[PDB]
């Protein structure tokens, strides 16, 4: 209840941590630990009736975010773990079910079968990109194919539970919490050309409500970097 | 020199051997290891996780997220079937493309038990009851709620808990996992009555596979 980091404070009341391991620290990489370790609340998305899903590429949603974004232009390298708090707040008269899954190395697929998607289309900075429940056509050149039953990666979307995940059932549950360690092949990588995590929120059972209730429900994502450090002097 | 004598099957290439081989690049000083999280030592750890079962195919929901949702509504006749699916393997069943059933298509003989978890994603104010019938191999599919009750079953009160587990065995009539309305869905005013159920499947941790082959999911 009412946890705080730096100059921010959020409140909480069930956590699922990564692949079982907890994030920790390692020329010489220096340790900045107090200046940017805080809760970065992104803006809320609206869960409507015929909504399809959302995604965020994770070391890119915190690129225009304050002093964390200032520490990226000053540093060529870095390695960072995360802690993600997702909560949506509806009444007891709404009903639905969300899957909050955190995918490492999620290559997206382009709509044209020869090309590859562009950086403006793969990831909106600190802004959610949307799945669709129709097909993106082949005629446009560089756009992400977002048929949500394939999850944009050419796979069964029901089998996405092999990644570290959490269900949000409005009947019983209210929030989700993930703690994701640093997963990469190299120990310290180029932070400008690599988005090594992807946070997806997909409504399996759609939102429903009776006439009179509030016709859409907000979802609030909060990311807090754990064990961030960069390389330089 | 030392007298040797070469036997049959000497200068042959058997593709399934294990022999020492001369290294093309010695003196390279290979890159050391690194602790990356999430190591897989066996394929049965991939099968032990829960995955959503597309139990609502119906030829127009397969290109949707509606394939995973079982429709539940408050009708007027007491005693009806919600869903039902056989446990016959391979012949286009519903546990086929799931994350368990993708490993068991790489082998020819496998035999064990299955967890089946159901989750009621309806309102918090809706109540009701369900029967969860399992017919063993040899016994027919039940055609009433009554003779479904006379077999093995679980009565699932939705208002108490929102998740019910049912464990069956699955070996390479072979079974049925039908489910029935015991009572209707009682709902207050200003609450919707059309609710859905999701179904998860897993491996019940204790089984084995033999004789690896290649998957039928390719051109």
């Amino acid at each position: 209840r009412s946890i705080t980091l730096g100059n921010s404070t959020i409140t909480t009341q069930n956590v699922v941590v990564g692949y079982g391991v907890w994030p920790e620290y390692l020329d010489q990489p220096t340790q900045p630990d107090v200046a940017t370790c805080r809760f970065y609340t992104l803006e809320s998305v609206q869960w409507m009736k015929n909504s399809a899903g959302w995604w965020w590429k994770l070391p890119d949603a915190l690129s225009q975010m304050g002093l964390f974004g200032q520490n990226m232009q000053y540093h060529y390298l870095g390695r960072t773990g995360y802690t993600i708090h997702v909560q949506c707040n509806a009444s007891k008269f709404h009903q639905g079910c969300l899957l909050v899954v955190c995918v490492p190395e999620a290559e997206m697929g382009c709509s044209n079968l020869n090309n590859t998607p562009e950086f403006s289309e793969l990831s909106g900075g600190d802004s959610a990109r949307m799945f669709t429940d129709t097909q993106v056509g082949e005629s446009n050149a560089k756009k992400v194919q977002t048929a949500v039953w394939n999850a944009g990666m050419g796979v069964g979307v029901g089998n996405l539970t092999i990644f570290p995940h959490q269900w949000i059932n409005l009947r019983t549950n209210n929030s989700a919490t993930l703690v994701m360690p640093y997963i990469n092949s190299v120990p310290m990588d180029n932070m400008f050309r690599h988005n090594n995590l992807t946070l997806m929120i997909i409504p399996f059972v759609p939102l429903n409500y009776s006439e009179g209730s509030s016709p859409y429900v907000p979802i609030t994502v909060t990311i807090a970097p754990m064990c961030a450090e960069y390389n330089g002097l | 020199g030392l007298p040797v004598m070469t036997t049959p099957g000497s200068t042959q290439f058997l593709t399934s051997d294990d022999f020492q081989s001369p290294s093309a690049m010695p003196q390279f000083d290979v890159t050391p290891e690194m602790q990356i999280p999430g190591r897989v030592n066996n394929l049965m750890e991939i099968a032990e996780v829960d995955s959503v079962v597309p139990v609502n195919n119906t030829e127009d929901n397969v290109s949707s997220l509606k394939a995973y949702q079982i429709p539940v509504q408050s009708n007027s006749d007491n005693g009806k079937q919600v869903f039902g699916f056989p446990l016959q393997p391979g012949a286009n069943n519903v546990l086929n493309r799931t994350l368990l059933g993708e490993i068991l298509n790489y082998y020819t003989h496998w035999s064990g038990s299955i967890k089946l978890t159901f989750m009621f994603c309806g309102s918090a104010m809706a109540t009701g009851k369900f029967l969860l019938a399992y017919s063993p191999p040899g016994a027919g599919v039940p055609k009433n709620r009554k003779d479904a009750m006379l077999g093995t079953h679980v009565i699932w009160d939705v208002g108490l808990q929102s998740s019910c587990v049912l464990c069956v065995p699955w070996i390479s009539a072979a079974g049925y996992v039908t489910c029935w309305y015991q009572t209707n869905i009682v709902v207050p005013a200003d609450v919707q009555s059309s609710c859905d159920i999701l179904c998860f499947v897993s491996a019940c941790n204790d089984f084995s596979v033999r004789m690896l082959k290649d998957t039928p999911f390719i051109r």
């Epitope: 909504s51 399809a52 949307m130 669709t132 129709t134 759609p206 | 127009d60 509606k66």
Partner: antibody
């Protein structure tokens, strides 16, 4: 009741521009897909494009024949659907309809349930 | 993916059964094939959606069928007020292609 009227057609020199407009009343505008279909004099129909609802982000999907020339949009104030036609040719002389789609299960079948009365566009 | 309708011109007296077919070039799914009806000097109307389901306000004389790459539409009893043109729509990829048109004139 559902009522889709539209307006804006007329005469145009080939190589010019024209803007059609579809006025929608009788339903919530931000919840359905809205299409654009043309038909020449006594020929088959031809689908030009649609525009998805608010929950899918108002993205557009043009046909391969008119991609780059035409533009579908909407007005954020009132329930008016637009069609900016640019670089008109000799074979664009047709009757332009305005259609709507809905979800039948929870799925999106690609049908067009309600149609507009049709404005006529011809070139000279 | 183009659709061919046959016959183009169809004539039949009222009271009998007549049918038309719409054969696709490739495989189209059963849920993405629809039938429309356009009278002379009027906009089209959705008639049958997803190859078997009657729309709203349509009389029960019609029933669509077919699967794979061959689809059809049957009229059990022909009246006088349902003489129009009938088109079939599909979706395999983009774009949404229509039929050629089947004109029904009463005899």
């Amino acid at each position: 009741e559902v009522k889709l009227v539209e307006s804006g057609g007329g005469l145009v020199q080939p190589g010019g521009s024209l803007s059609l407009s579809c006025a929608a009343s009788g339903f919530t505008f931000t919840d359905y897909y809205m299409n654009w279909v043309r038909q020449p004099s006594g020929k088959a129909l031809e689908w030009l494009g649609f525009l998805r609802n608010k929950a899918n982000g108002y993205t557009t999907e043009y046909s391969a024949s008119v991609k780059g020339r035409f533009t579908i949009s909407r007005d954020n104030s009132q329930s008016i659907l637009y069609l900016q036609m640019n670089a008109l040719r000799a074979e664009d002389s047709a009757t332009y309809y305005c259609a709507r789609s809905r979800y039948y299960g929870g799925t999106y079948r690609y049908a067009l349930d309600y149609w507009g009365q049709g404005t006529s566009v011809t070139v000279s | 993916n183009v659709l061919t309708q046959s016959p183009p011109i169809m004539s039949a007296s009222p009271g009998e059964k007549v049918t038309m077919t719409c054969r696709a070039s490739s495989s189209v799914s059963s849920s993405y094939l629809h039938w429309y009806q356009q009278k002379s000097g009027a906009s089209p109307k959705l008639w049958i959606y997803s190859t078997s389901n009657l729309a709203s306000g349509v009389p029960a004389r019609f029933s669509g069928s077919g699967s794979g790459t061959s689809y059809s539409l049957t009229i059990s009893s022909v009246e006088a007020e349902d003489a129009a043109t009938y088109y079939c729509q599909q979706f395999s990829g983009y774009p949404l292609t229509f039929g050629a048109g089947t004109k029904l004139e009463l005899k």
